[PDB]
Amino acid sequence: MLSGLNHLTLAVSQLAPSVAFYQQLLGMTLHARWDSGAYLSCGDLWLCLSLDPQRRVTPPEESDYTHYAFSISEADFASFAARLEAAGVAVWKLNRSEGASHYFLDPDGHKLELHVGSLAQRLAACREQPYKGMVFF
């Protein structure tokens, strides 16, 4: 039986700029780097960057809604989002609201998000302002 996420692996087109993005800009911990990959952590998350010549830099209008959200506290959210905008990080748009979030792209067009709040808080907010057709189990 499954117990959670073991690791997230992102395919990247150029290793050095991607390591710089996740380590220098987002502040993840770099544990190891080799000619074709890197291992980073963010709290409990094991992130692997894997050099892949198949990876294409895709505009957000032509990629689907698959995306990866990172937790940040209420106190740090705005100042962290402001730092990303000042660094010229591009944005993308989701079709629906899901609370306090900032949506941004990595150098290869992976869709990232900063989000404040847990699943439990999201469900409680949705009880008051449900999505269309929502049912709770």
Residue 63 binding: pick among a copy of itself, Mn ion, ligand R9Y, none (C-beta 5-8 Å cut-off by kind): a copy of itself
Q: Please say whether the beta carbons of 38 and 19 come within 8 A.
A: yes
69 binds a copy of itself (CB under 8 A): yes
135 binds ligand R9Y (CB under 6 A): yes
In 3D, which of 57, 37, 51 has the Cα closest to residue 105? 57
- Complex with ligand R9Y: residue 23 or 58, whichever CB lies closer: 23
61 binds ligand R9Y (CB under 6 A): no
The neighbouring-strand residues paired with 23 are none
Q: Least distance to ligand R9Y from the beta carbon of 40, Å? A: 13
- Complex with Mn ion: residue 42 or 69, whichever CB lies closer: 69
86 binds a copy of itself (CB under 8 A): no
The neighbouring-strand residues paired with 30 are 40
Amino acid at 117: G
Residue 102 binding: pick among Mn ion, a copy of itself, ligand R9Y, none (C-beta 5-8 Å cut-off by kind): none
DSSP type of residue 130? P
77 binds a copy of itself (CB under 8 A): no
In a 3-state reduction of DSSP, which class is residue 38?
strand
Residues in contact with 58: Cβ distance below 8 Å, sequence separation at least 6, in sequence order: 108, 109
